[PDB]
Design a binder for this molecule. Sequence first.
Ligand SMILES: [Zn+2]
Ligand SMILES: [Zn+2]
Lengths: 405, 407
Amino acid sequence: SMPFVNKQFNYRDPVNGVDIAYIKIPNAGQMQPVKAFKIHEGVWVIPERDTFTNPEEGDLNPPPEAKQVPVSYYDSTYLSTDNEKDNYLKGVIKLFDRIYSTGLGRMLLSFIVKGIPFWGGSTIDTELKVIDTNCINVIEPGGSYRSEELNLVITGPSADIIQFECKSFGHDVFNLTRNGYGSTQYIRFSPDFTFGFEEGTFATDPAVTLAHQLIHAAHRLYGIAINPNRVLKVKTNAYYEMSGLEVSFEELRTFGGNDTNFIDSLWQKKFSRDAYDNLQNIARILNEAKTIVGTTTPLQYMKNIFIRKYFLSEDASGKISVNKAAFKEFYRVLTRGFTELEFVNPFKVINRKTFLNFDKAVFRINIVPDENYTINEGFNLEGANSNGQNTEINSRNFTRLKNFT
Amino acid sequence: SMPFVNKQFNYRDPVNGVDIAYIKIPNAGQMQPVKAFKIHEGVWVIPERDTFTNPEEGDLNPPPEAKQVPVSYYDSTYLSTDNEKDNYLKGVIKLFDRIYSTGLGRMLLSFIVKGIPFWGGSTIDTELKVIDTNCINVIEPGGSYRSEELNLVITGPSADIIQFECKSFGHDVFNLTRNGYGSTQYIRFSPDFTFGFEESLGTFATDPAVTLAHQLIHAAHRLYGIAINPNRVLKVKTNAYYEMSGLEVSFEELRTFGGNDTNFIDSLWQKKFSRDAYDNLQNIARILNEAKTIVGTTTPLQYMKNIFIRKYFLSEDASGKISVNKAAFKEFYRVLTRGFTELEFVNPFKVINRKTFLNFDKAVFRINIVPDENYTINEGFNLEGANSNGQNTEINSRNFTRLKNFT
Ligand SMILES: [Zn+2]
Ligand SMILES: [Zn+2]
């Protein structure tokens, strides 16, 4: 019942340079400042359509029908008015509160908040330094600017309104999402739409959809995401030779349950070994660090951030190391405790059972009013059932916009 | 506690032409007669190696070792002596009694006994006639034979002892297993071996009653003509240089196993399979309504119509017109496809079991279930208590002799 977001935010609240500010994303060259809200330590929400993180995706034009995929939805006017942005902000906040009301969501969000990208940006071996792509540029009242570290940004979707994804900026030398370091994560997401599926009789709770992307973000903030070149190719058609479906190992892991079982035990051992090896490397770097630059935080306090992040051990002499048992639990939580299917019962929802059950339609929803959707029950306000997710019974809460069939 | 098999059978019991006789399968061209036991109405057991249903698999020769797959087991001497065939016979009967001791198995076996293959074999549209794939020839004193209908035959395995499967004749040219008609089913099976597996990630052994129930579920689907087309398959592949082998599993197998595997079948496929089965019952209803004669039997036409009215849970109105009731079909189809799964038997049998096909068996073990000190009708291997220590191949090591690992 403790909320994740400890104060009320309205889109029209005046900027203050602290938790309501105009910001710019350093890797986005051509952007004008956008109003953003720091809803929790390290977590910002930008209630705008994402035209700025990627130069190529800088417009909201729907492609020609022949280039569209069936599972997509376009509306260039969505999220253009202040009333819409206020509703978007409140809906995203409500979902974080819903996630945080479960034991598992509390653990997921604590990992995310603790998951400071590693300070591995110095060329000098004994010196800790931030990596500049894990910051935003904050505009302050008075015309002054500052750089500020953060872990997670939620933005509105790009052109395709239902293409939810978790992305981050790259490094010239490191694969930050896979070398244990982590990097600031940017999630495209909308609380104003959800998908329908059949046992489109039932609507997905948008809290599950956000939790899914937050699991990708946690994997990527802890630098243990599976290489996107590890992929499973699926066919259910005896006739199409080439045509089929492709799903990454990272997606099989993140979804969980029986889908993860498509990943061989030998791959799991390898990923575990690799993540353990990368923690050992980070410990060596922390042990060899003697100076720190770009902050007034003392060196030991900065080391402690990562001792806590990676559940590292420290002995009497200050030597940092990886405890095998602590790593085992750390890795289990991140890869097996945090899955989409593990959230189904804590949320008390009905949900898709596998990636092979494709969404059938997209619906408009409005979760901000408590008579429609609550923190503790989502759509299922009336009782301990999934009638609230039934798009026929509870039809007033789900307006069908497009079928994918 | 009532058994499925209401009398005792010994392999050496003298033939009697009724429930112990030498038989020939008409669709198996070159087979010599084999001793068979009618353990229940419509159900026969042939306690010998299957060298006769398929002439090409008429030998027990182990293929060249270089040609063998890891998941296989060969022993040309298994089931060669009368003592072995007797032990096989009694073990299969014991598993039927174990299945029959559960409410769900009793329902499954009731569907199997009632599931007479449809009499749709006539060249004339208005005439009911048997289809020849659904009979055996029973040898009588004097060497002459008579034709007798049946639903199910259990035989010993062919060359590969652990290749358990449910098969039927005319599968190449007929669609009897998918058009609602059904056909007599032949199961290769052994109660003398079972598989070991590890709890989800060969410490635990599968209860052979679960394995037989699995094959009987295939048989029920095929006796009711609702089997999913075997070209409906789930195929997964990775890069060709990856050690981990791609996989192939039919939709029919995903359905039969149950649980989370069935969820890999998209709802749109499920709706189609249901619609197809409903349409095929409408065809059967139309054929029964238009039937005016019956041939090859003194059973009156109306009695045979009633047999299939009951089989398919068809409705009759005041005028005698047969039709499919939507609610009756929905329940009919649910029972056959959702009620009868391998995983639905796990708790009735009180066993530990694999949860998915993606958890592959690790080994094959020799077992001996006939002695009650090893395995009972009501408890299987788990004699000790309400646990699965009886299935632990380490604790209960005396009941599981490891023969081959598949890794
Ligand atoms: Zn995903
Ligand atoms: Zn099967």
